[PDB]
Amino acid sequence: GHNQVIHQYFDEKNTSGVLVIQTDKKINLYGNALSRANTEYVPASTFKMLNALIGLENQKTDINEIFKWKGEKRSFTAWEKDMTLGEAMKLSAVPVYQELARRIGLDLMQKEVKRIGFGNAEIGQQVDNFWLVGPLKVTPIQEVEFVSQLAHTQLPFSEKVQANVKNMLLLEESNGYKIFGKTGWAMDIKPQVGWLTGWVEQPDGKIVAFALNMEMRSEMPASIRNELLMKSLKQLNII
């Protein structure tokens, strides 16, 4: 795991990004813009993780509820269907999570966001968008520590709610490994922020958490985040 071959990966793909790795509470930095690791960015869709935890834990929803599509056009046509929280989770289908956020409400949301200490822990006044255009912001090291705690079932929620949310986040089974994670793309902010935050569950059971964060642009393919993550995790020989 050379802290420079990963740099040629970010150098090549033409971007400014960091990959934060946390192995058993030890944090390492890789990429071509290590300064991004302690700078705040909007969490975009990575916040759905906390949103789901707050919603489940507080019985505003449950993992079997079917969220009904009432027919408005949405940004992607794969969002234009009925789905559960878990399906909405894998599609990053923000209208489902905004309706959840309105159920939770500002007071409960701000109290939970502050109790968890997520990012700057500020949600402002509009319950249904504070994670997409501000004021809520989080550094990539804070995301890796958050997602690390979730992988270890260490966040201040009941175990069953955490386990429910983890099972919403399965991305790949490979070589006997498991990668869990949540993509994120804030396309309105400039520069655009890309997020891919999760963890690797190595066959021995060991857990290594990651927060890939990078500046983004409209023409890039969605797979650019997984590409940059997988070829890195194998270069550090995590996978």
Ligand SMILES: *[C@H](O)[C@H](CO)[C@H]1C[C@H](S[C@H]2CN[C@@H](C(=O)N(C)C)C2)C(C(=O)O)=N1
């Ligand atoms: C929603 O706020 C946002 C999360 O930050 C959405 C938009 C982008 S990309 C978009 C492309 N089609 C969706 C998808 O991946 N599937 C499977 C239909 C999501 C995004 C992201 O992927 O980072 N999440």
